[PDB]
Subunit: 126 residues, 4 copies
């Protein structure tokens, strides 16, 4: 897996004193961005080429909460890679504690149309 | 279903020109809140009584994007109701266009422990 | 003034149990959007014309907190209108209580350059 | 000054292709947090002791936009320190370009009342 380390910010919490569930998707985005960057092909460069990654679906299950100032790790793994789509899984740990498990599925678009995942992208996803 | 109507705000979009996927979960939260308020039992009243609803998992499938200033409707439906949990489904439409389909599963805690869903809550969920 | 009415959502709060200060700027945005819409010229239509409103500065002072489920009103007023800029003030009330006071200053851009505020926009700001 | 380094995330942008103005205040919060942590007194420790910092006002002037994937630095400086309040200033740079200049003013509360800033806090602010 690819490991992405992160500390919870105050604005990411809500009145329940935990990180709002919607923010977990933002953390997963950050992990995907760091993954691509680590492979030498950041998403920002794909966008410059006219490529868009489009989210098809997203799932998260929440096991234990994150609190303000918690340090956690997102373990990202490529789960599925087909002609037109790819799927990442995520496991969120705080130290030894499993906080959450998730996945997202994506496709790619160029010039308003769905395109087969380019070879240049397949090379970095793998 | 219960219908919640909402207009996309500029800050809810990202550089792709669409509503960021994480914001859909915020729209679903707003829908649930309005649903409970419509039954005469707002979540804020539950909280004041020391009850807390805990999200167990969330899933969203994205079909067509939402843009700035789009008016849309979330069709909220109770899908499951058991002794300890409940599940809502959501279908998002913009005019006639299916935008997204989602669900969330929840339980309830009081004094730091999982509790069976109070009869007072059961009566408003159904 | 123009009055914009709003209820606090759960995700707008933080662990302190109040609405995070950064969200007040989002509320002011919503008020400006509703103001323009009420005048028959929504910002979305300005954007379609290639116009961008650019924020120059923003100030907020916080007097009393907003809590989850509070209903409040933003009183928006046009404070300053010059050739290239305009300034709105905002006062946030919850019932009789003054919650916050703010202002924002803006200019306009078209085709990458600062432009005099168009007559078509001056007519709706006034 | 204290220097806080940060990369713009995709969800922090809006449809204009720039970082939404409200997110700048979130960056300033992150900077303050890191500053206190660097002094060996994180805000989370203050909170655990029952202290709360309260924002009184915030101001930001926007000079040049931030884009997705931009690396920037917030230069944080203590500007004022009195018996009951303190003020930070912030200058945001991306490479050599001044992006924004800001300030925030704060006080402290304990048991629901304004308190003079504890000597333990004074020692880390300075």
């Amino acid at each position: 897996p690819f490991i992405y380390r992160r500390r919870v910010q105050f604005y990411e919490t809500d009145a329940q004193g935990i990180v709002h569930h919607s923010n977990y998707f933002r953390y997963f985005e950050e992990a995907r961005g760091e993954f691509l960057r680590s492979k030498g092909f950041p998403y920002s460069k794909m966008r410059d080429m006219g490529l868009e990654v489009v989210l098809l679906n997203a799932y998260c299950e929440y096991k234990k909460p994150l609190f303000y100032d918690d340090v956690f790790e997102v373990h990202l793994n490529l789960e599925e890679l087909s002609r037109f789509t790819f799927t990442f899984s995520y496991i969120v740990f705080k130290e030894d504690i499993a906080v959450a498990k998730a996945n997202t599925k994506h496709c790619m678009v160029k010039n308003g149309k769905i395109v087969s995942i380019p070879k240049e992208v397949l090379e970095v996803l793998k």
